[PDB]
C-alpha cells in the first residue's frame, strides 16, 4: 500500500483464449448472437469483456494507502467504455495490453469519490478506453491528498470586434505564437484540459488549466496557435473557464434530435446466483456471493454484480439497436443508481434522442419490478454504412435550398461566404440569381470597388493545348481596360447556362450537406461521390479539400471554360447538346457494344460529334453528348430500330464481324442523311429510349474539350492548397469519376489513372517513385 | 352438392381447356392430379373426363389409373 | 510512409484526376458498384436539388443486384435530401 | 415423428405423466434419473443446460416448467421426444398386453423420422419388460449425445430484430434454422437456392434436409441465410387469393405458402458435420452400441432406403450421420408395402403420420395416430381407439 495514486498503473498482458469469451457470453446472460464461433479460430468478444481483462489494473487505484477507504462500503457509481475512434473490436487472438491511471478522487461531504481511466491496447496501439466511478462512502477530510482533474466542453470564440482580440492579450493566460496573428474574423475554439487540488472543499490549492487554442482555416479545419497556460494557488473557481462561458459558447458535439424516437421496452432477468458471473469477471467480491457480507454492508442481501447488470442491458441494446452486429457499438456508458436482487425482471428502456459525430445518441434506463430506477446511460452507436452521392447539373431550379437557407443557421453561413465573396470579387451575387432566375445580367464597372471588380473579370485566362504550347488567350474577349459593363445572356435564365449552375449547385449540396454536419449526421468512415458536377461539392464536403470561397471559384471558372470553347448563337444557345439512350427500350438483347456499334459509326460516318459520355446503369442509362446534328440522328435511327428490333447483336452471332461492318454501314449512311433534314435550330425530342437533357447546352465529359484540360490543371494547381488536402478522408472513401475505383494511393492507381488518359505527371512519378522511400 | 344428397347419383363430368366450344383456363389434369381423393370420399360421385379424347388407345391409361404414375401418383382410374 | 510527402503525393494525384476528370466520361457503372457491392452500403443519400441519383440508384438495384442483396438481405436504403429529409434528420412523425 | 412437427411437444408429456402415471411412471423416473446421471458423469454438460434438466419436478407444477427458449432447443428437447415415442409405444403394448418383443414380433417393419429413427432401432432390441430398460438407457443416451454434441457444434444466437418484426407482416414465424416450402418441385428449390448458395460463403450456405413429401420440401441453413432464401422467393411470390382464374395456367404464378418449423438446430446439413465423430466417441465411451443380430423387425434408412440389418460397420454410426450430414428421402424409405402406418412420434394430428397419409393416399394405406384421442370427421385416419378396437369397427380400410 505504498502504491502511489499519481503514477499510473501497469496491468498485465491478457492473451484472449477462445472459451473465456464463450463462458463469460452466458455467464453475463448475453444472448447476443454476435460472439461465439467454433474453437480452433479465434473468437470475438465483447466490449465488456475490457473489464475482463482490465479489473486487475482497473482496482489497484483505489487500493494505495494514502487514499484510505472502508473497501466494505465501497459502492460502485457508473461505468462507461470508449472505443476510441479507428480501432477495430477486440478479438481473441489478440494479446491485449492493458493500463489504467485513476484521473481524480473528489471527496464530497457524503463520502469520496474515485475516477478511474483505463486504457486498453494492442499491438502498442491503444484500443479502447474504460471509465469507472467507484464511492467510499462516508466522511473524509484528507484534502491533502485529494485532486480532481477534468476534460472541459471545448469553448468557441468567435471574435467580431477589434476590442476583444485586446482583452485575449490582456490576459496572462492566453498566448500564442505570434502575438501578430490576425485576430479578426477568425474563430477559436478551446479544447483545454484543466487540473485542480483542493484544500477545503470550495478553497482550491492549486489549479491548472491548458489545451491548445485552434482556429477556423478558411476550409473550418481548425489548426492550432497557442496554449492556454493556468496556474494559480488558492482559488476559488476557475477563471480560464469562465471567461470562455460568458464570452464564447458551448462546442457541444452531443445534439438533440427534435423528437425522442422510442426503440423497445424490454425485460431481463438477474441470475439466480452471483458466482457464475464472480468466476467468469475475475471479480470475487464477496459482497454478491456470500451472505456474512452483505448483511456486514447492510445491504438487501447478496445483490448482483453492477457490472454484469451493466453488460446484460448493453446486450441487450446491441441486439435491438445496433440489428445484432457488435461493431457498431463504438461506446456505452451507464450509471449504477440503486442496487438490485438476484432473480428479479427489469424494465428496461431504449430510446434515441441525440446524434454525436454522425452516430447514434441513445439513452436507456432500466425500471425495477416496482419501476424504480437502477441504471441510467447512454450509448455510442454506429448508424449503417451510408453512402452520400451528389449530384450534377441538370437538376437545377428555384429557390434550391433557399428554404434550408432561412433555416439552418450553419446553412446559411455558407450561402453568405459565398455570395459575398462574389458580391465583392465579381459584383454578382447568387443569392439574387436562384430565387429568381433572371433572363440577362449585366455587370457594372463602376467606381474604385468597379474598376478592381473588371480587372478582375479580365484577369482569368483560357489556356489552350496546341502543340504542347501553353497558349495563353483571353477568357473574355469582349472586355477590355475601356470597357465599363458586361453582359450575360440566357433565354430561360442563367440557370439554364452552366456559367452560373455549377456554382449554385456546388453552393446548395454544401450548404444542405455542412448543416447535416451541424446535426451531426455524417460518419467519419462514409463514403461520397458525384455524378459529373457532384465530384466538388463532394470533396470540399467531406475531406474539405477546398474553402468554400475558392470552391466557388474553381467551379464559376470549370463553367467558363466548358463555356467559351463552344460557339454560341447571337443570344448564347449552342449546336450542341447530351441525349440520354435507355438500351432496354430499344431491344431486350441491346447489349453495352451496341450502343459502341451504333453511335461510333455515326461519328466515323457523318464527320460529327456524338459520344456517350456517361455509364450510369448498363442497359438502362447511358447518356450521350456531342454536335447535335449527329445527336439526332443517334436519335431517330434508333426510334426506327426499335420500330424494327434489328439487333445487331445477334447479327454479330447469326453473321460474322466484318461483314456486318458494312451491313450497318449501309442502315447506318442510310438513316444519317434521312435524319440530316434538320434545320439550323436543332430542337431536340423525346422518341422511344431517347430522354432529351433541359438546359444542358455544352457536351462535356467528351474528347471534344480534351483541348481545355492542362489549363484547368494549371488553374487547379493555384486553389487547392496541399496543405488543405487531408489524405485521411480520401483514402477508399472517394471514388472518382475519372478512374471508378477508390481513391488510393497506390502506383498501379496512378498507372491506372494514366493508361487511361495518357498524363506526364503520372509516368514521371511512377519513374520516380523512390520518393516512396526517403 | 354431394354431402347434401348421399344417395342421389351425380356425375362430374371434369372436362379440362384444352376443349372445344366454350373454354376454361385451367389445365386438364393437375386439379384432378389433386381433387380426386376428395371426390371419391363420396360413391355418389360418376368422375367422368374428356376435352381430347379420339381413340381408345388416346383414353386407356387414364381409365386404367396409369396417367398418375407419370405424374407420381397413386393410379387414379376414372369413370368414363 | 511518410506522411508529408504522402500528402504532396496525393495532392499531385487528386489534381490530375480531377483535371483530366473534364473530359473524360464518367464511369458510373463500377462506382455504382464498388461502392453498392464491396462497401454494401445500406444507406445511400442522395444529396442534391431533385432524385435524380436515388432514381438512377433503384434501378441499378433492381436490375442486377436483386439476388444479391436477398442472399444477403439488406435494408439498402435509397434517399434524397429533397424528398426523404424526415428519415435522414430521423424526425418522422408517429 | 422425428424433430419439428409440433411447437409444444412437452405439452405431449403432460397426460403421459397425468394419464398412464400408474403406467408411465416407472420408466420415466427410470429415463429422468439416469439422463441426469449423464449429465453429471459429461465433462462440461453441466453448462449446455442453463436452468437444468430436473424434468420429475417440472411435471407436477408447470411454473417449474421453463420456457420454449429453453425448453425447444435440441440439448433439452431431442431425449424428451425420443422418451415420449418411447411412452406412447409402452401404453400400447402394455394396454394389448404385450411384452415389448411381443409387440414387436408383429410389425413387418419399424422406421424414424429425422430423429425417431433411433426410437425405432431401440424399440427393434427389445424382448422383454425388463430387457426394456437397457434399451430406453441405449436410445435415451444417444439423443443426449445428439443435442449435446450439436448444441455446441453450431448453437443458437440471438435474430437480429430487423428481420424478426420484417418476418411477421410478411405471414412468418420467428426464423428457426429449418424452413418448409410447400407447392414447389426438389428441383425448383434447388434452382434457386443455387441462386442463395452462389452468394454466401460455405459457412452460410443452404441445402434441402428433409424430402418430405414430393412436392413439400424443407431446407436448413442459418436463420440468417434461410431468411435469405425466403427472401429470394418474394420475388416469386403470388398471393394465394389473386385468383389466376383469368389468366391460361402456363402463364401463371406458382403460389405456395411456406413457414419455419419450430426447431433448434439445422439438422441434416453441413453445419454439424463436425459433431460427428464428437458423438461416436460419446457412444463408445459408454456400452450404446446396436449390432444387426440383436434388431428382428426390418428398419429403413431415412437416406438409403434399405434395411439396417446390411451395413459395413456399427449401424449406430450410419444413425447419426442421418440426423446431421445425410438427408431423409421420406418417399425413398417408405418403399414398404404395408397397409397400416401407426406413429408414436410427436405432434399427434400434425405428425408425421398425417403427412404420410398425405403422401400414400391413393396407395390403399390407412394411418392411424397412436398419440392423441380424438376424432377426425372425414376419418381418413385413425387415433388411439382405432389400436384397441375389438370389434369391426377398428380393422378400417381406406380406399
Known sequence: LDFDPRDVIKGKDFEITAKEVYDFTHAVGNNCEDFVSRPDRTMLAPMDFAIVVGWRAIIKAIFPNTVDGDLLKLVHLSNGYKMIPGAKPLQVGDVVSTTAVIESVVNQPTGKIVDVVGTLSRNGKPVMEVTSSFFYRGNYTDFENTFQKTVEPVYQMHIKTSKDIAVLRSKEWFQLDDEDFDLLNKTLTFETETEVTFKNANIFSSVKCFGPIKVELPTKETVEIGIVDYEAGASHGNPVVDFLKRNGSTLEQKVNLENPIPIAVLDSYTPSTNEPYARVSGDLNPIHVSRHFASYANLPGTITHGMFSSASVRALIENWAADSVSSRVRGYTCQFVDMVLPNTALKTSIQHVGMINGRKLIKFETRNEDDVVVLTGEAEIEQPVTTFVFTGQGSQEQGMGMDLYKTSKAAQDVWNRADNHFKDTYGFSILDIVINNPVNLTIHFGGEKGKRIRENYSAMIFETIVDGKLKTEKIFKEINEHSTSYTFRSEKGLLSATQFTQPALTLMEKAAFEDLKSKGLIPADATFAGHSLGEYAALASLADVMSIESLVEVVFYRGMTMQVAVPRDELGRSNYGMIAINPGRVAASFSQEALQYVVERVGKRTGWLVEIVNYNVENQQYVAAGDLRALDTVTNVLNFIKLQKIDIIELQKSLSLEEVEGHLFEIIDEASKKSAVKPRPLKLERGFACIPLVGISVPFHSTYLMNGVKPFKSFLKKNIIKENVKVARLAGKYIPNLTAKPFQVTKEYFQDVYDLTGSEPIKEIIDNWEKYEQ | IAKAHPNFPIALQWTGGRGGGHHSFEDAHTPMLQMYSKIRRHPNIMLIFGSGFGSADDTYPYLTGEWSTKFDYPPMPFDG | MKPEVEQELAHILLTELLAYQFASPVRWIETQDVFLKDFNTERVVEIGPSPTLAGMAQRTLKNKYESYDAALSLHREILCYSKDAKEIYYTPDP | ?399
Request: contains cysteine.
Open chain 4, 1 to 399: 415423428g422425428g424433430q419439428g412437427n409440433t411447437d409444444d411437444y412437452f405439452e405431449e408429456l403432460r397426460d403421459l405423466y397425468q394419464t398412464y402415471h400408474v403406467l408411465v411412471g416407472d420408466l420415466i423416473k427410470f429415463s429422468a434419473e439416469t439422463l441426469s446421471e449423464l449429465i453429471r458423469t459429461t465433462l462440461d454438460a453441466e453448462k449446455v443446460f442453463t436452468q437444468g434438466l430436473n424434468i420429475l419436478e417440472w411435471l407436477e407444477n408447470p411454473s417449474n416448467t421453463p420456457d420454449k427458449d429453453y425448453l425447444l432447443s435440441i440439448p433439452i428437447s431431442c431425449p424428451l421426444i425420443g422418451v415420449i415415442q418411447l411412452a406412447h409405444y409402452v401404453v400400447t403394448a402394455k394396454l394389448l398386453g404385450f411384452t415389448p418383443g411381443e409387440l414387436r414380433s408383429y410389425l413387418k417393419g419399424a422406421t424414424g423420422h429425422s430423429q425417431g429413427l433411433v426410437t425405432a432401432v431401440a424399440i427393434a432390441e427389445t424382448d422383454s419388460w425388463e430387457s426394456f430398460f437397457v434399451s430406453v438407457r441405449k436410445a435415451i443416451t444417444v439423443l443426449f449425445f445428439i443435442g449435446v454434441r450439436c448444441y455446441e457444434a453450431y448453437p443458437n444466437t440471438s435474430l437480429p430484430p430487423s428481420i424478426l418484426e420484417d418476418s411477421l407482416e410478411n405471414n412468418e414465424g420467428v426464423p428457426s434454422p429449418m424452413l418448409s416450402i410447400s407447392n414447389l418441385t426438389q428441383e425448383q428449390v434447388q434452382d434457386y437456392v443455387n441462386k442463395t448458395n452462389s452468394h454466401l460463403p460455405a459457412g452460410k450456405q443452404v441445402e434441402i434436409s428433409l424430402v418430405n413429401g414430393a412436392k413439400n420440401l424443407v431446407v436448413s441453413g442459418p436463420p440468417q441465410s434461410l431468411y435469405g432464401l425466403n427472401l429470394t422467393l418474394r420475388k416469386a411470390k403470388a398471393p394465394s387469393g389473386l385468383d389466376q382464374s383469368r389468366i391460361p395456367f402456363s402463364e401463371r404464378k406458382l403460389k405456395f405458402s411456406n413457414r419455419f418449423l419450430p426447431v433448434a438446430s439445422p439438422f441434416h446439413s453441413h453445419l454439424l458435420v463436425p459433431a460427428s465423430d464428437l458423438i461416436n466417441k460419446d457412444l463408445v465411451k459408454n456400452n450404446v452400441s446396436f449390432n444387426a443380430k440383436d434388431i428382428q423387425i426390418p428398419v429403413y434408412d431415412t437416406f438409403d432406403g434399405s434395411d439396417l440389418r446390411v451395413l459395413s460397420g456399427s449401424i449406430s454410426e450410419r444413425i447419426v450421420d442421418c440426423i446431421i450430414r445425410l438427408p431423409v428421402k421420406w418417399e425413398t424409405t417408405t418403399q414398404f408395402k404395408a397397409t397400416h402406418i401407426l406413429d408414436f412420434g410427436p405432434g399427434g394430428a400434425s405428425g408425421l403420420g398425417v403427412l404420410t397419409h398425405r403422401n400414400k393416399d391413393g396407395t390403399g394405406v390407412r394411418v392411424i395416430v397412436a398419440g392423441t384421442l380424438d376424432i377426425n370427421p372425414d376419418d381418413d385416419y385413425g387415433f388411439k381407439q382405432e389400436i384397441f378396437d375389438v370389434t369391426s369397427n377398428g380393422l378400417k380400410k381406406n380406399p
